[PDB]
RNA sequence: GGAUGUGUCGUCGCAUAGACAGCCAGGAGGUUGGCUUAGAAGCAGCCACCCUUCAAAGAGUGCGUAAUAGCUCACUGGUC
């Protein structure tokens, strides 16, 4: 239900680009 | 597991099984192989452990009821008459006697769902399958 | 199978892998003792719906079928047996095992069809030729369908000894 | 931001823009735009649009990056095609419904680029498997 | 180290030897590493 | 209760028209099967386990991740 970069249909995940 | 109504108490002895079949109600079935007494309490452990490695069917067969109470020490003593018409209740199983036998399930699905069941009795049991055909 | 002896005393044997049994009609109720193995082998095919060949020691083919055998407990092990030697037009009745076959509308459904009845008594069969089984249908089966003995097909004359009405087998629900 | 390459695959919807659980660190931590994928992709979603068409990539570093679309979720327009929009818990004991050959003619001539099998029948009978399934019924066939 | 009464395999590694009249269980993995003694 | 510790009887079994274990190489497309989920794609859990090609390669062993992925298996050929 939450993390950072992490899961595949909420929301976080992680983090760059 | 327990009895409905009786009279209520009892004695011990024994020889070998004398009414325990082999196939019938099933496919493949469990057979004692000592002379014990079956807690209706290590029935239950059984039945319930078969259950778990089934999820339907039900193709269980307990053809072992306990139609036999037990007593105890109400706690030490001794001056005073016999006791405890309630310690738990017994069903006397002897060599060759069938108290399992699922049916429906695959050869393996069969050969656990005993091996586990036999894990929990105070004796040594075989699984057994056919050719079993005296009167019908 | 060629069983030999046939005393009373089966000493020479009990040791020796060796079953003991008898068979008979009416007429001659001659005394016997087979292999153990070779019945061993033998009878499961066959079964009770199964004649074979008896030269007993000397020479003399005789024809029967496999009455009543009796096994040991505490070993699954057999140790007697009971031959009732074929006749030629009528042997008795005889006992048949209920067989399923192509998957039932009731297994895949919900649940599954059990078999009420194992084996099968019915009314003379006819020496000669005597059903050693006897498939049935399941398929139509659905939530709760029992199927009795005045259903399944019949193996051209033979008939019924078993009660019609009864419950042969029956689709088993789930849990 | 580096030299770094090499390849990931994924499943994005049509006509629909990625803000982070689709993408943004997915592959985006890889040195790759995705506001330069909510457009490029997302373009061509629209002669199919109304879907998750899967989608490969292919990296090669710095801010560059590729992709190929393929063939939408035909699971979609079924439904659309008798009325249900999600899928059956039992698909042999409870089954959505049942359908004509003859839509099965374009779904090899979409899927076709995918589809190696033999000739004709071969993919024939593979839908059907799928079909089969799923939770419906094959129209017509055999003698009759 | 499992020191267990009932040493039985775990996976298709559990090598069941007969060391110095013991048996044991050298697995590639080795959380599965048994021996009664 | 456990274990390729030895002795002896029985059962399948599978097999120079060249298996088992070893080895080089392969491994399928549908499909991240449908179902379910915050997602799970051969591998948490219902349903099934069909199709195509082939010498082959099973909607699937287990390990592994938040699922991906990666790593091997069952099936296939040559070397002995």
């Known amino acids: ?17 | 597991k327990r009895t409905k109504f009786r009279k209520q108490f009892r004695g011990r002895m024994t020889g070998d099984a004398k009414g325990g079949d082999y196939v019938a109600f099933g496919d493949y079935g469990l057979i004692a192989m000592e002379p014990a007494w079956i807690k209706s309490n290590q029935i239950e452990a059984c039945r319930i452990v078969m259950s778990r490695h089934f999820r339907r069917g039900g193709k269980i067969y307990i053809r072992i009821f306990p139609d036999k109470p037990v007593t105890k020490k109400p706690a030490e003593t001794r001056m005073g008459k016999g006791k405890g018409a309630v310690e738990y209740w017994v069903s006397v199983v002897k060599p060759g006697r069938v108290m399992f036998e699922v049916a429906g399930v695959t050869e393996e699905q069969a050969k656990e769902a005993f091996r586990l069941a036999g894990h929990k009795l105070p004796i040594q049991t075989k699984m057994v399958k056919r050719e079993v055909y005296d009167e019908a | 199978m060629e069983l030999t002896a046939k005393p009373r005393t089966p000493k020479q044997k009990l040791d020796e892998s060796m079953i003991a049994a008898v068979a008979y009609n009416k007429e001659n109720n001659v005394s016997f003792a087979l292999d153990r193995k070779a019945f061993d082998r033998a009878f499961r095919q066959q079964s009770t719906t199964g004649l074979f060949d008896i030269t007993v020691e000397g020479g003399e083919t005789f024809p029967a079928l496999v009455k009543a055998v009796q096994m040991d407990k505490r070993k699954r092990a057999p140790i007697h047996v009971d031959f009732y030697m074929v006749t030629y037009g009528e042997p008795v009745e005889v006992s048949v095992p209920v067989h399923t076959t192509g998957r039932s509308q009731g297994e895949v459904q919900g649940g599954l069809v059990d078999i009420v009845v194992h084996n099968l008594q019915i009314v003379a069969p006819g020496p000669r030729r005597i059903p050693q089984e006897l498939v049935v249908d399941v398929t139509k089966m659905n939530i709760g369908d029992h199927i009795t003995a005045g259903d399944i097909k019949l193996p051209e004359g033979c008939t019924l000894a078993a009660d019609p009405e009864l419950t042969v087998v029956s689709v088993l629900p789930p849990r | ?144 | ?37």
């Open chain 1, 1 to 17: 239900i939450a993390s950072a970069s992490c899961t595949t249909x909420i929301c976080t995940c992680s983090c760059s680009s």
């Open chain 5, 1 to 37: 180290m499992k020191v267990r009464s009932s040493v039985k395999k775990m996976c298709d590694n559990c090598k069941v030897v007969r060391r110095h009249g013991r048996v044991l269980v050298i697995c590639s993995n080795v959380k599965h590493k048994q021996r009664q003694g």
């Open chain 4, 1 to 144: 931001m580096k030299k770094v390459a090499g390849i990931v695959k994924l499943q994005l919807p049509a006509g629909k823009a990625t803000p982070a659980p689709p993408v943004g660190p997915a592959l985006g931590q890889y040195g790759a735009n995705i506001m330069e994928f909510t457009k490029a992709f997302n373009a061509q979603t629209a002669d199919k649009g109304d879907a998750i068409i899967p989608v490969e990539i292919t990296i090669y570093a710095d801010r560059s990056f590729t992709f190929i679309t393929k063939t939408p979720p035909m699971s979609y327009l079924i439904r659309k095609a008798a009325g249900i929009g999600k899928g059956s818990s039992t698909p042999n004991k409870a089954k959505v419904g049942k359908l004509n050959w003859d839509q099965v003619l374009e779904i090899a001539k979409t899927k076709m680029p995918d589809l190696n099998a033999g000739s004709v029948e071969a993919a024939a009978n593979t839908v059907a498997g799928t079909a089969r399934s799923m939770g419906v019924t094959v129209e017509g066939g055999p003698n009759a």
